[PDB]
Amino acid sequence: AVALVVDNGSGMVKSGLAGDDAPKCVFPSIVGRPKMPNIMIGMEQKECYVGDEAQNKRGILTLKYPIEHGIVTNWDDMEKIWHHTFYNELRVSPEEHPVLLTEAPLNPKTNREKMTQIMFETFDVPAMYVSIQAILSLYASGRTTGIVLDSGDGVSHTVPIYEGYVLPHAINRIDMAGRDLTYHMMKLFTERGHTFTTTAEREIVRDIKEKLCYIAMDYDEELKRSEEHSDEIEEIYELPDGNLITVGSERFRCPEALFNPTLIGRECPGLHITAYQSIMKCDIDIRKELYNNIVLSGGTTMYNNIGERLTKEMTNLAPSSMKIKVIAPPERKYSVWIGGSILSSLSTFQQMWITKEEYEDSGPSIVHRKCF
Amino acid sequence: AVALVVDNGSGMVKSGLAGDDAPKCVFPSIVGRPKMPNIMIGMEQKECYVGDEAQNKRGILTLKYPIEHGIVTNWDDMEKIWHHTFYNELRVSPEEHPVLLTEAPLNPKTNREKMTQIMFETFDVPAMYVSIQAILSLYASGRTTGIVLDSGDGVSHTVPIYEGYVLPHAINRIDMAGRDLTYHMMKLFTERGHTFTTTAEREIVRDIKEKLCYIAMDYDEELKRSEEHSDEIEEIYELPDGNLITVGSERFRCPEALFNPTLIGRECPGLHITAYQSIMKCDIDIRKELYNNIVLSGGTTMYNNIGERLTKEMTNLAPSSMKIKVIAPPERKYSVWIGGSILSSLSTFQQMWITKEEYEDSGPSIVHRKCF
Amino acid sequence: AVALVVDNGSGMVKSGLAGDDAPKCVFPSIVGRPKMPNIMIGMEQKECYVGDEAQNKRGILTLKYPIEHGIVTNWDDMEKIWHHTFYNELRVSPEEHPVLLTEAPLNPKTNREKMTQIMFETFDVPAMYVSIQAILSLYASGRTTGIVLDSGDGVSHTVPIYEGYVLPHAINRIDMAGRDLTYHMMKLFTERGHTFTTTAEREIVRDIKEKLCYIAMDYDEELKRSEEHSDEIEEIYELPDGNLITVGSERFRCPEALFNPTLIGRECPGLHITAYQSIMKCDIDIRKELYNNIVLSGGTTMYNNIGERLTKEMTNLAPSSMKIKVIAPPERKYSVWIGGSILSSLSTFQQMWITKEEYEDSGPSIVHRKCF
Ligand SMILES: C/C1=C\[C@H](C)C[C@H](C)OC(=O)C[C@H](c2ccc(O)cc2)NC(=O)[C@@H](Cc2c(Br)[nH]c3ccccc23)N(C)C(=O)[C@H](C)NC(=O)[C@@H](C)C1
Ligand SMILES: C/C1=C\[C@H](C)C[C@H](C)OC(=O)C[C@H](c2ccc(O)cc2)NC(=O)[C@@H](Cc2c(Br)[nH]c3ccccc23)N(C)C(=O)[C@H](C)NC(=O)[C@@H](C)C1
Ligand SMILES: C/C1=C\[C@H](C)C[C@H](C)OC(=O)C[C@H](c2ccc(O)cc2)NC(=O)[C@@H](Cc2c(Br)[nH]c3ccccc23)N(C)C(=O)[C@H](C)NC(=O)[C@@H](C)C1
Ligand SMILES: Nc1ncnc2c1ncn2[C@@H]1O[C@H](COP(=O)(O)OP(=O)(O)O)[C@@H](O)[C@H]1O
Ligand SMILES: Nc1ncnc2c1ncn2[C@@H]1O[C@H](COP(=O)(O)OP(=O)(O)O)[C@@H](O)[C@H]1O
Ligand SMILES: Nc1ncnc2c1ncn2[C@@H]1O[C@H](COP(=O)(O)OP(=O)(O)O)[C@@H](O)[C@H]1O
Ligand SMILES: [Mg+2]
Ligand SMILES: [Mg+2]
Ligand SMILES: [Mg+2]
């Protein structure tokens, strides 16, 4: 019985079969509902559109995200999304395959309890398991020592691991990700005379950010250069309705909020500062090994010149006798899914499943004593 | 029980049976009354002539139009016209067939209430229904996405529809149609020495307009050409009394008021401007689909070189990366009736009729909550 | 040298001298142009009418608004309006008095740059300054802590201020104001059989809205009452040509779009929702102080039963242990001008002017680093 790997993010949902090295079904996590009267009798209509079929007809729909900051807010929408994933994307009966789920660290217990209850009572899966995302990201890299910096759409967290042992007192988690960058980009576009307010406009701005953004090495010099010669960074983007929008300095002022959250109005520290403070809460012996195995993960770390900028920032904070190597592997967008698929194929893991009888005898609270 | 399709316009009335692709009874909507003393005893005379029998003996009659700008002004004349349609044209008892009626958008509620009350108390039809004309025009084309530009004799309106959902905030309606063009033609004929004042003269001018009018591609160049060489556009028309009238430039200066209502003294915008402003009030995503499904309807859109002129005007207003296709199907004069006949034959529509018992229990106000 | 206070709105222009508590020249912001041939030789005519002299002879004029949503669209018309204000309304040379201007938040930089360039090159004022409207509205109330909800003719925005410090990350701005309400009223009047299309008809509808509108406490019950007994809310309004129009339910269905923008077809949230979301983006400590200092401003907040309705809506959203007090002072129509006049008389402000030499040495870009 091949297991199912389902990574439920805040902006995207990945799903596939264990043993493969690439997810088979990746689609946005949105629920669309119509806001207009239906007049044309004779054509069938649906109450709610889930996934890509809500991203194409979004002009007449209102879109909802059922997950905010890695926490499920609406459970009916999440049930609809899981049903769509199981029966419309993979088309495999969930009553014959074990399911491996992922979750961010430092989350409420009720989230895990409700997830287990839904997975066991509605779909009636044989076995299930919940694991942390940073552990799977480290699994996907084929290492055992390093500090993992994961950053997705709702939450970014750093976790150190040394030779198979995790240090829970040095785990950090902040709520600042690509959605805040999208909002910052929307705010910056106002200064040029362009206004985006609706959800579809937000998706357009998100696509613009994903296409035309990069990280600058020296922020002050780039701002100075954006005055004497701004023509070198100008780009033209074609709106879906045929209009053309000019993107200039906003190509590098949007991601800068990752290293300076004061721009968006947040008091939380930056990314390099967070990594350094997470390293400094570990024992003095393992700091040298942690400094040389920095691993990047998530979709928000896909900008250009991210590894070099992070290395330069870390160098100014670390002792002069220390070597810093920021590992930024390709295809890190799906690193968590690859790590989960690798973990689910190990022969040793077959005795760590939460079976149906154990849940029935113990209840939804069993997920705390078994899963970490 | 086959339903009756009755399209009540401002200048013409179409009527027929559901399932056919061509109206069976098309006749003008006029009520004629004599204005001369009757002397010849022995021959029968009637107080009022309705339909074609008032168009032939119009020399001794005064003609009244009971509908102005899609609004019924005199209800007794409309009752007479409906009686003539039911008992003299189709010769089918209205007490056994459901009736499907049409109406222009953005009309007063009292019109619909009075129409329902008359159809239910006088004729005592089993079931009835009222629908918008643009929806039926889109039904007749076999599509689901597009912007419909309907233009008849009293009112011209544009309505966008996207995948079965109508956008009521983007519906436009102006009162400028073939009757205003007839008045403009009458005014233009004065400059050549010809005067038309009576109603029969108005009908003659209307026939001249329907026969010898076309739309020019370039107005200024055509006006310039109408001086150096006017003989190429000269036509001779035989008046009913045998006289000959010469029609020259007025062949293309009459319809030009559709794209420039300032000629007739109106401040309303043109047709292409109205279509563009109706497209621009929709969401940015569906504008591309609306731009490629422009549908023409009504009898006023039957001029020559109308589609090419509309396409050229729309091209200068749309973004350069957009494709515009003006759909101008033949037999679009009766497109609304064809769409209504198609709609009335669907098996799904059989549960959307306003039955007699519902009207009796609720009153004439039921037509608002059920019909759109 | 007494300064000049000039508040440039989207529908009205206020102007006066610093130190007074009431604007001296208030007039609409419209530019009128004739659309008819001039035949009577011997009487002088003007190419364009600005201000009240275009509101009286509007029957033969086409009227243009040079400001849309707080953004100047046509600069020639704005120059004409400023010239009329300086030389025809106040009759004071602008070459001897400093000028204080106002602007809505979150506006393009080019607007401010062009405004400064025009004020410094054409009129050649000694000093100038640009400030936000909500700050002046809070100045006029004699407070330092509160959330200001300004709503005029083109844009409505909310800004929180705590003890002299503004929170730019909690400032909201939406484009929904009295002009949209006028359009909604025009659409509602169609259902009774009345049609307004021209600009003068729009002004008539605006006057009707300003005279006979109020806000209902319970919308559903009012709609139910408007059926059993509609005679209690009927009013008669005399049209300028002597006709009488009956205004019934539309007295309270027009302003309802402020608390439900879905009626007019907009996806933006209501006013109470916007205020609540602007309060919830501030720090937890200052929310209690913000909840008790809600200040209303603008001309669109002049309806009846607005404060009570806003208080009732806010109560259902705030925690049960919080006290909400909506401050709705009289003469809030000119609150921004009063606040600007108070600010311009302070002895401390005399060192915050943009002098001519600084602009000459730095350019039109100086307005960004000095003015907020
Ligand atoms: C950007 C887009 C199309 C664009 C029209 C494509 C073209 C290419 O850009 C322009 O034409 C820039 C132009 C503009 C540019 C410079 C200027 O000194 C004034 C206006 N901007 C405008 O007219 C503003 C007016 C405006 C409203 Br109301 N409140 C606002 C708040 C802040 C700023 C401006 C505004 N405007 C129409 C919009 O934002 C509209 C709603 N935006 C869209 O529909 C998105 C989905 C696509
Ligand atoms: C056009 C018709 C017949 C026509 C006689 C057929 C022939 C073929 O056309 C002419 O002979 C053109 C001729 C004419 C031509 C050139 C000219 O420098 C002067 C007159 N026009 C006239 O005599 C005018 C005189 C007129 C009266 Br009074 N007020 C008017 C207001 C404006 C203009 C002119 C007038 N006239 C007799 C008419 O309009 C009559 C009432 N029209 C008809 O019965 C219609 C139903 C059919
Ligand atoms: C409201 C005004 C005067 C009024 C005549 C004053 C009087 C007091 O009201 C009436 O008589 C109501 C009456 C009417 C009432 C009930 C009814 O079942 C049918 C008509 N309405 C009409 O005749 C419509 C006809 C109409 C044209 Br075309 N398209 C329209 C689109 C929608 C609705 C109706 C129409 N009509 C003449 C107008 O709108 C004119 C253009 N409106 C004006 O000039 C304004 C500036 C002042
Ligand atoms: N090439 C790219 N450049 C910059 N940002 C990107 C790129 N690709 C994706 N993103 C951002 O990453 C986010 C997706 O992250 P993802 O890892 O899918 O989150 P989750 O963990 O919730 O699945 C998107 O919001 C997008 O803004
Ligand atoms: N071949 C044609 N060329 C130009 N105009 C025409 C032609 N046929 C009809 N018309 C105009 O169209 C009008 C009829 O439109 P119609 O669709 O019957 O209006 P309604 O919607 O009221 O029935 C007439 O007034 C006539 O002037
Ligand atoms: N007494 C009133 N009742 C309701 N609405 C009003 C009243 N007075 C003015 N208004 C509305 O307020 C608008 C004027 O707002 P104003 O503050 O002058 O805008 P601006 O900020 O552009 O100057 C007008 O469009 C009008 O519709
Ligand atoms: Mg993730
Ligand atoms: Mg028609
Ligand atoms: Mg204002």
Q: Which amino acid is at B109?
A: K
- Determine the 3-state secondary structure of A68 from DSSP: strand
For residue A188 the two structure tokens come to: 């910056």
| Contact indicator for C206, C182 with CB cutoff of 8 Å | yes
Cα A336 to Cα A149: distance, rounded to the nearest angstrom:
12
Q: Quote the crossing angle between the two packed helices A133-140 and A335-344, to the nearest 10°.
A: 80
Residues of A in contact with C278 (CB under 8 A): none
Helix-then-strand count for chain A, H and E: 14, 19
By Cβ distance, the residue of A41, A60, A240 closest to B162 is A60
Q: What does the buried/exposed string (b/e) look like for C295-314 if buried means 16 or more CB atoms within 10 Å of the residue's CB?
A: bbbbbbbbbeebbebbeebb
DSSP B105: S
Cα dihedral angle (C218, C224, C225, C228), rounded to 10 degrees?
-170
* B109 and chain C in contact, CB less than 8 A: yes
Q: Which amino acid is at C100?
A: L
- Dihedral sign for Cα A34, A39, A40, A41, please: positive
Distances (CA, A) of C165 to C144, C160, C168, C283: 9, 9, 9, 13
Tokens 């009112």: give the residue: B155
B71 within ligand 3 shell (Cβ under 6 A): yes
- Determine the 3-state secondary structure of B326 from DSSP: strand
DSSP B299: S
Q: Quote the crossing angle between the two packed helices B271-279 and B306-315, to the nearest 10°.
A: 50
Burial class for B3, CB neighbours closer than 10 Å (0-12, 13-18, 19+): buried
The secondary structure element, H or E, covering residue B186 is helix B178-190
For chain A, helix, strand, coil in percent to 5 are 40, 20, 40
Contact (CB<8Å) B319/A42: no
List A121's β-bridge partners, or say none. none
| Contact indicator for C307, C328 with CB cutoff of 8 Å | yes
By Cβ distance, the residue of B108, B262, B267 closest to C198 is B267
Enumerate the H helices of chain A as residue ranges.
52-55, 75-84, 109-121, 133-140, 178-190, 199-212, 219-228, 250-253, 271-279, 287-291, 306-315, 335-344, 356-362, 366-370
Distance B74 CA to ligand 3 centre (A): 15
- Determine the 3-state secondary structure of B80 from DSSP: helix
Task: From A97, A153, A88, select the one nearest A123 (Cα to Cα).
Answer: A97
| Contact indicator for B213, B255 with CB cutoff of 8 Å | yes
Contact (CB<8Å) A238/B283: no
DSSP A2: -
Distances (CA, A) of A102 to A14, A29, A167, A337, C73: 11, 15, 19, 9, 52
| Contact indicator for A81, A54 with CB cutoff of 8 Å | no
DSSP A348: G
Residues of B in contact with A201 (CB under 8 A): 284
- Determine the 3-state secondary structure of A210 from DSSP: helix
Q: What does the buried/exposed string (b/e) look like for B293-314 if buried means 16 or more CB atoms within 10 Å of the residue's CB?
A: bbbbbbbbbbbeebbebbeebb
Calculate ∠ Cα A73-A78-A81, nearest 5°. 150
Contact (CB<8Å) C62/B268: no
| Contact indicator for C27, C89 with CB cutoff of 8 Å | yes
Q: Which residues, at least 6 apart from B271, have a Cβ–Cβ distance to it below 8 Å?
A: B149, B151, B156, B258, B259, B310
**This structure's resolution (angstroms)?**
3.3
Backbone angles phi, psi at C365, to 5 degrees: -85, -5
Distances (CA, A) of A93 to A3, A6, A53, A99, A100: 11, 14, 22, 11, 15
| Contact indicator for A261, A267 with CB cutoff of 8 Å | yes
- Determine the 3-state secondary structure of B101 from DSSP: strand
List B68's β-bridge partners, or say none. B71
Determine how β-strand C172-174 pairs with β-strand C244-247.
Answer: unpaired
Cα dihedral angle (C157, C161, C165, C169), rounded to 10 degrees?
-50
Taking phi over 0 as left and psi of -120 to 50 as alpha, with beta for the rest, A198 belongs to beta
- Determine the 3-state secondary structure of A165 from DSSP: strand
List C371's β-bridge partners, or say none. none
| Contact indicator for B169, A39 with CB cutoff of 8 Å | no
| Contact indicator for B263, B256 with CB cutoff of 8 Å | yes
List C150's β-bridge partners, or say none. C157, C297
For residue A257 the two structure tokens come to: 């909020």
Q: How far apart are the first and last CA of chain C?
A: 24
DSSP B333: G
DSSP B148: E
User: Which residues precede chain breaks (C–N over 2.5 Å) in chain A?
Assistant: none
| Contact indicator for B145, B267 with CB cutoff of 8 Å | no
| Contact indicator for C367, C130 with CB cutoff of 8 Å | yes
Sequential DSSP letters for A232-289? GG-EEEE-TTS-EEEE-THHHHSGGGGS-TTTTT--S--HHHHHHHHHTTS-TTTHHH
Q: Which residues, at least 6 apart from B188, have a Cβ–Cβ distance to it below 8 Å?
A: B250, B253, B254
Distance A98 CA to ligand 7 centre (A): 21
Q: Which residues, at least 6 apart from A284, have a Cβ–Cβ distance to it below 8 Å?
A: none
Task: From C131, C368, C357, C107, select the one nearest A227 (Cα to Cα).
Answer: C368
Cα B119 to Cα B193: distance, rounded to the nearest angstrom:
48
Task: From C191, C120, C168, select the one nearest C358 (Cα to Cα).
Answer: C120
Q: From B282, which residue of chain A is nearest by alpha-carbon distance?
A: A59
Tokens 């996207």: give the residue: B162
Long-range contacts made by residues B258-263, C-beta under 8 angstroms, separation at least 24?
B258/B176, B258/B181, B258/B215, B258/B300, B259/B309, B259/B313, B261/B176, B262/C35, B263/B184
Cα B336 to Cα A337: distance, rounded to the nearest angstrom:
56
> Does C299 belong to an annotated binding site?
yes
| Contact indicator for C162, C138 with CB cutoff of 8 Å | no
Cα B227 to Cα B53: distance, rounded to the nearest angstrom:
43
Distances (CA, A) of C95 to B19, B28, C363: 80, 71, 19
Q: Which residues, at least 6 apart from A37, have a Cβ–Cβ distance to it below 8 Å?
A: B165, B166, B168, B372
Determine how β-strand C165-166 pairs with β-strand C156-162.
Answer: antiparallel
Experiment used for this model: cryo-EM
Determine how β-strand B4-8 pairs with β-strand B99-103.
Answer: parallel
| Contact indicator for B177, B156 with CB cutoff of 8 Å | yes
DSSP A38: B
* A264 and chain C in contact, CB less than 8 A: yes
Q: Which amino acid is at C300?
A: T
B153 within ligand 5 shell (Cβ under 6 A): yes
Tokens 């933006």: give the residue: C268
Residues of A in contact with B321 (CB under 8 A): 238, 242
- Residue B329: how many CB atoms within 10 A of its CB? 11
Q: Which residues, at least 6 apart from B341, have a Cβ–Cβ distance to it below 8 Å?
A: B5, B16, B17, B18, B19, B20, B21
Burial class for A95, CB neighbours closer than 10 Å (0-12, 13-18, 19+): exposed
Test mutation, C36, C188, C197, chain B, max B CBs within 10 A? C197
| Contact indicator for A268, A176 with CB cutoff of 8 Å | yes
> Does C2 belong to an annotated binding site?
no
Cα B128 to Cα B103: distance, rounded to the nearest angstrom:
13
- Determine the 3-state secondary structure of B242 from DSSP: coil
Cα A154 to Cα A137: distance, rounded to the nearest angstrom:
17
Burial class for B328, CB neighbours closer than 10 Å (0-12, 13-18, 19+): middle
* B73 and chain C in contact, CB less than 8 A: no
- Determine the 3-state secondary structure of A174 from DSSP: strand
SS (H, E, C) chain C: CCCEEEEECCCEEEEEECCCCCCCEEEECCEEEECCCCCCCCCCCCCCEECHHHHCCHHHEEEECCEECCEECCHHHHHHHHHHHHHHHCCCCCCCCCEEEEECCCCCHHHHHHHHHHHHHCCCCCEEEEEEHHHHHHHHCCCCCEEEEEECCCCEEEEEEECCEECHHHCEEECCCHHHHHHHHHHHHHCCCCCCCCHHHHHHHHHHHHHHCCCCCCHHHHHHHHHHCCHHHCEEEECCCCCEEEECCHHHHCHHHHCCCCCCCCCCCCHHHHHHHHHCCCCCCCHHHHHCCEEEECCCCCCCCHHHHHHHHHHCCCCCCCCCCEECCCCHHHHHHHHHHHHHCCCHHHHCCEEHHHHHHHCCCHHHHHCC
B193 within ligand 2 shell (Cβ under 6 A): yes
For residue C359 the two structure tokens come to: 């602009």
Taking phi over 0 as left and psi of -120 to 50 as alpha, with beta for the rest, A331 belongs to left
> Candidates B5, B6, B8, B12: which one to mutate for ligand 5, based on the most atoms within 8 Å of Cβ?
B12
| Contact indicator for B340, B85 with CB cutoff of 8 Å | no
Query: Which atom of ligand 6 lies nearest, measured to the CA of C67?
Result: 22
Burial class for C9, CB neighbours closer than 10 Å (0-12, 13-18, 19+): buried
Taking phi over 0 as left and psi of -120 to 50 as alpha, with beta for the rest, B164 belongs to left
By Cβ distance, the residue of C62, C191, C265 closest to B108 is C191
Distance A152 CA to ligand 7 centre (A): 5
DSSP B70: T
Contact (CB<8Å) B109/C264: no
- Determine the 3-state secondary structure of A108 from DSSP: coil
* C224 and chain B in contact, CB less than 8 A: no
Distance C67 CA to ligand 6 centre (A): 15
Calculate ∠ Cα B366-B370-B371, nearest 5°. 105
Q: Which amino acid is at B253?
A: R
For chain C, how big is the Rg over CA atoms in Å? Answer: 22
Q: Which residues, at least 6 apart from C174, have a Cβ–Cβ distance to it below 8 Å?
A: A197, C155, C156, C157, C268, C269, C274
Burial class for A284, CB neighbours closer than 10 Å (0-12, 13-18, 19+): exposed
For residue B51 the two structure tokens come to: 């339909």
Cα C331 to Cα B20: distance, rounded to the nearest angstrom:
68
For residue C291 the two structure tokens come to: 């909840």
Contact (CB<8Å) B321/A238: yes
Chains that touch A (3 or more CB pairs under 8 A): B, C
Cα A123 to Cα B324: distance, rounded to the nearest angstrom:
49
- Residue A298: how many CB atoms within 10 A of its CB? 25
Q: Quote the crossing angle between the two packed helices C75-84 and C109-121, to the nearest 10°.
A: 50
